[PDB]
């Protein structure tokens with residue numbers, strides 16, 4: 001596998017050039033600053049430190065390098081996070097998987113990978129670049145992540161038997177999914193064995209009593225959702241009609257000399273409306289943008305109501321622990337909080353949900369609300385048995401920075417450490433990669 | 442106005458015959474039997490006695506005659522309900538409105554109308570049959586209910602200025618809407634002044650402190666939703682694309698001799714798929730029925746979770762009243778129950794919601810859940826201050842008949858009175874109507 005994408009700029013100029021252009025999509029928006037409530041709901045987990053909205057594929061490697069979530073490893077065995085964090089960021093992951101094998105790849109801390117995983121998300125992620133057919137300009141789409149191949153099988157869709165159009169969406173489905181870390185090596189695995197609906201994955205995580213972390217306010221064993229667009233897309237009316245991710249996000253387009261190719265500048269479809277929705281819809285651009293924005297507002301409105309409930313629940317649960325509640329007394333409440341938050345998180349962890357499957361988004365939040373209702377109703381009784389009967393009062397969480405101080409984060413300290421790491425360690429990584437010829441000189 | 446529909450059978454055979462055929466749609470399904478939870482939620486209101494799903498237009502008059510809800514008037518001034526209950530059932534309503542004027546029509550009890558309102562929902566409800574153009578076989582659509590005309594104005598769409606296709610949906614919008622009874626005469630009025638969304642109508646009813654009834658379990662001043670398909674259709678993706686009620690429910694169709702006309706057998710569109718959906722869709726019948734049925738199950742699943750919460754809330758509120766809670770103490774809880782149930786009710790009072798605007802149905806239920814959550818959380822605290830800290834236990838409500846006994850209904854007594862009334866008073870009404878030539882001999 002060839003991870004150095006430049007290698008391919010000469011044979012495949014139109015793709016290389018449009019691919020490279022995702023660097024223009026560089027706005028990196030602080031999702032926590034926008035919704036400080038998230039810091040409470042993720043108390044005790046790295047997402048409470050740093051969580052931004054997605055940007056261009058071109059920023060993948062640098063963004064995982066720079067999140068507060070990966071911390072500031074002193075050495076190849078240090079740092080909070082495992083090798084698996086590289087998995088969906090670079091074609092060097094494919095290199096390493098074929099070089100050291102999967103287990104070899106997953107072994108160790110993220111930091112171990114720093115001077116190995118250096119090329120931007122690119123050609124060998126989606127393409128079997130080895131094939132002689134690829135130089136000839138045929139796609140030769142492939143799944144380069146074996147854990148993604150397994151999952152497509154688990155879901156009844158073995159890649160190599162799927163038709164061309166299913167395969168298009170599956171390449172995106174290598175990374176744009178909900179996943180968890182499986183086993184002591186912490187390998188990536190999509191929780192799809194029982195299906196891809198919220199309640200499927202819920203029972204699945206429960207069969208194996210898995211938790212991503214324990215919320216540090218309520219002591220609840222939490223599950224974390226991550227960007228489930230593949231699951232959520234297939235549930236939506238476009239996916240039911242086999243409108244693929246490529247149909248909206250990678251439209252066929254023309255050379256300055258009318259040669260047709262696929263736009264690799266993967267971004268917002270509305271930017272190229274004539275070449276995307278317009279292919280299948282007669283409504284004009286402003287009409288369709290308007291509909292989409294209404295679904296975004298609806299979901300956001302309900303989204304915040306659920307989040308407000310969960311903020312009350314985590315702090316009520318803390319008030320109960322402080323009042324001497326025992327584990328047996330907390331366990332049913334924690335079950336409800338775990339379930340409520342999982343449904344909420346999965347509902348909105350994809351920033352596309354209002355477009356891909358707005359009605360599933362709304363449905364998940366409704367069922368999140370049902371569990372949050374139970375959680376807080378059980379807490380009001382529990383606290384009563386402890387002699388407390390007033391409303392539990394929440395610290396000021398009107399800003400990201402207040403919410404972070406409120407759950408005990410030393411943000412200056414944390415940012416200082418990260419800034420020191422970025423400034424000094426990353427350039428060491430790139431110099432090592434150059435010497436080893438992993439990175440273009 | 443000509444309320445005797447037969448009058449028109451000779452000039453307009455294809456319409457008359459298909460119109461008459463809604464009598465084939467005669468299955469009258471007991472909605473209460475299916476969901477006994479409704480009896481609790483409507484405790485103290487007529488809907489807790491009798492509530493069926495819709496059937497054919499041909500059964501409108503007889504169904505309003507036979508519901509337990511209209512009771513068994515001893516005379517023209519007796520009975521629980523007003524004249525307004527006739528409003529959306531018969532073209533004799535249009536007769537009376539033009540003959541006695543609107544105020545004259547609304548004055549009095551339902552019972553007063555019994556020998557006056559006797560023809561089936563029909564031609565003069567939707568058509569200006571007076572127009573010479575109508576005999577010539579032009580539609581000459583009209584709004585025969587002035588309170589419907591006002592509402593279309595209130596919504597920025599004066600009928601006579603709307604285009605042909607908006608007008609099609611507006612005739613259905615004379616009856617298929619959420620309404621309330623305004624003033625001492627209890628005239629029909631659509632609560633559309635602030636718009637037709639759930640939150641519009643909610644603030645609207647609140648501005649004027651209106652209540653339909655007080656739930657007899659929780660003493661909450663309740664609002665009742667009714668079949669808001671007009672409002673809900675305009676909100677959905679088909680209405681946004683001006684697919685009219687006629688496009689799915691009254692398809693254009695062909696004579697045995699290829700004369701084209703509009704099917705007046707108003708029923709389920711799927712029955713005539715080749716002539717309805719198929720006009721605009723390429724998916725086949727089973728594919729589209731399958732989608733529609735999934736949305737129906739999603740909504741029904743959420744629907745029952747909200748209902749269960751509201752059942753708990755009404756009985757918890759009762760427990761609190763029983764424990765001595767004062768009005769000041771109850772008022773904030775009652776506000777939340779009123780709001781929660783209103784959002785739920787409006788979300789599912791239309792049996793078409795999963796088809797017309799599934800996502801607005803889901804959304805409303807989500808916001809119903811948020812208020813139900815607040816209601817029960819405040820109740821748990823209120824009860825605590827009364828020395829109660831255990832879960833409030835709910836009577837057995839597993840059947841319609843159990844739930845009805847549980848809220849204090851004497852159903853045998855009620856049914857016996859109704860049965861007596863139907864057997865003896867109705868045939869008197871029809872004989873009077875014949876003698877006055879209101880009803881075909």
Ligand code: HEC
Pocket residue numbers: 050051052053054055063064067069070081084085086087088174175176177178179188226227349350351
């Ligand atoms: C595929 C299964 C992934 C694994 C494993 C990890 N990430 Fe990821 N990440 C993935 C996608 C598809 C996206 C974009 C969509 C989205 O909703 O964000 C991302 C994005 C990020 C970002 C940028 C945004 C942000 O959160 O600031 C960061 C910083 C990031 N990912 C970090 C990260 C870490 C630290 C991981 C190891 C736990 C990790 N990702 C794994 C897909 C996948």
Ligand code: HEC
Pocket residue numbers: 005008009012015016019121122123124125126127137138139141164168171246250260261262263264
């Ligand atoms: C996934 C995120 C991709 C990355 C990274 C790259 N390509 Fe791609 N490419 C992708 C898809 C989904 C498709 C279309 C397949 C189909 O069935 O239509 C393609 C296609 C190509 C082609 C074929 C010609 C064409 O349709 O334009 C070429 C020559 C190609 N891709 C080249 C290419 C190069 C050089 C890349 C690295 C810079 C690269 N692709 C990355 C998806 C993805």
Ligand code: HEC
Pocket residue numbers: 025053054055056057058059060061063087088089090121125126171172173174175176245246249250266267268
């Ligand atoms: C793992 C190798 C990925 C594959 C395969 C695909 N995407 Fe991706 N995507 C990935 C990451 C890590 C990120 C976040 C980048 C960051 O640094 O923040 C993304 C992001 C997107 C976005 C958002 C773009 C923006 O400007 O905001 C989109 C629209 C997107 N990805 C689409 C997409 C499609 C359509 C894919 C299949 C061809 C696809 N991605 C594959 C990682 C990976």
Ligand code: HEC
Pocket residue numbers: 053054055169172173176229230233238243244245246247248249268269270292293296351352355356
């Ligand atoms: C058209 C029917 C689409 C298909 C098929 C897919 N996506 Fe999409 N996506 C679409 C739109 C219109 C938007 C933007 C919504 C808006 O408010 O403008 C998106 C967005 C995304 C994003 C996030 C973008 C961001 O926050 O920067 C991602 C990560 C994304 N889409 C992924 C994605 C994948 C993986 C798909 C195949 C499973 C896919 N989309 C299909 C429209 C459409």
Ligand code: HEC
Pocket residue numbers: 237238241243244247248269270276277278279280281288289291292355358678722723
């Ligand atoms: C063909 C490959 C499509 C492209 C490209 C886009 N859409 Fe689409 N859309 C498509 C189908 C086949 C359908 C189902 C209706 C039908 O014609 O049978 C739709 C439906 C929608 C809807 C309504 C459903 C809903 O989710 O509420 C919307 C709002 C919609 N499509 C939006 C949309 C946008 C914004 C697109 C460009 C980003 C777009 N579609 C592209 C097929 C296709």
Ligand code: HEC
Pocket residue numbers: 491492493494495496504505508510511522525526527528529615616617618620629668790791792
């Ligand atoms: C229009 C503004 C109406 C007024 C005023 C009343 N009703 Fe009605 N009713 C209306 C529609 C559009 C429908 C069918 C749709 C639906 O969801 O039911 C009905 C149906 C009935 C039925 C049949 C089903 C049932 O509940 O058993 C009955 C018995 C009925 N309506 C009774 C009724 C009474 C007693 C009224 C006065 C309070 C009344 N309706 C007013 C529209 C309208």
Ligand code: HEC
Pocket residue numbers: 446449450453456457460562563564565566567568578579580582605609612613687691701702703704705
């Ligand atoms: C509303 C529930 C209606 C009732 C009751 C009746 N008609 Fe109707 N009719 C209705 C609509 C919505 C339309 C279509 C208008 C359009 O723009 O296409 C019609 C049309 C007719 C016509 C016109 C010819 C045609 O398109 O078939 C005729 C001759 C007609 N209607 C006759 C008719 C008679 C005789 C009725 C009482 C038995 C009657 N209609 C009732 C809606 C409604």
Ligand code: HEC
Pocket residue numbers: 466494495496497498499500501502504505528529530531562566567612613614615616617686687690691707708709
């Ligand atoms: C008041 C005069 C009405 C107008 C105008 C329209 N409808 Fe109606 N509809 C009305 C009632 C009172 C009822 C319930 C009948 C009963 O006795 O239960 C209904 C019912 C329907 C139904 C359900 C039919 C079934 O078989 O279950 C549908 C599909 C329906 N109505 C459609 C409809 C359309 C499309 C209209 C505009 C042309 C329309 N109705 C007008 C009362 C009135």
Ligand code: HEC
Pocket residue numbers: 494495496610613614617670671674679684685686687688689690709710711733734737792793796797
């Ligand atoms: C196609 C896009 C439709 C339009 C436009 C309207 N309706 Fe509809 N309606 C449609 C379907 C497919 C169904 C049945 C759903 C199912 O599960 O099979 C319905 C149903 C109704 C009903 C209730 C039927 C019943 O319970 O017997 C009513 C009262 C109804 N529809 C009313 C209605 C009105 C008033 C409309 C214009 C505002 C309207 N529908 C448009 C499909 C479509």
Ligand code: HEC
Pocket residue numbers: 237281282678679682684685688689710711717718719720721722729730732733796799
């Ligand atoms: C033209 C007058 C239509 C008729 C008749 C029916 N539908 Fe439709 N539908 C129509 C449009 C213009 C759209 C929007 C997408 C697009 O092509 O631009 C749709 C969309 C749908 C959808 C997807 C949206 C959603 O609500 O989830 C479904 C599921 C759908 N339509 C179903 C449907 C059925 C069951 C119909 C017969 C009862 C039907 N449509 C008729 C236009 C028209």
Ligand SMILES: [Ca+2]
Pocket residue numbers: 053054055
């Ligand atoms: Ca973005």
Ligand SMILES: [Ca+2]
Pocket residue numbers: 178179180223224225226
């Ligand atoms: Ca996860």
Ligand SMILES: [Ca+2]
Pocket residue numbers: 494495496
């Ligand atoms: Ca029916």
Ligand SMILES: [Ca+2]
Pocket residue numbers: 619620621664665666667
């Ligand atoms: Ca009402």
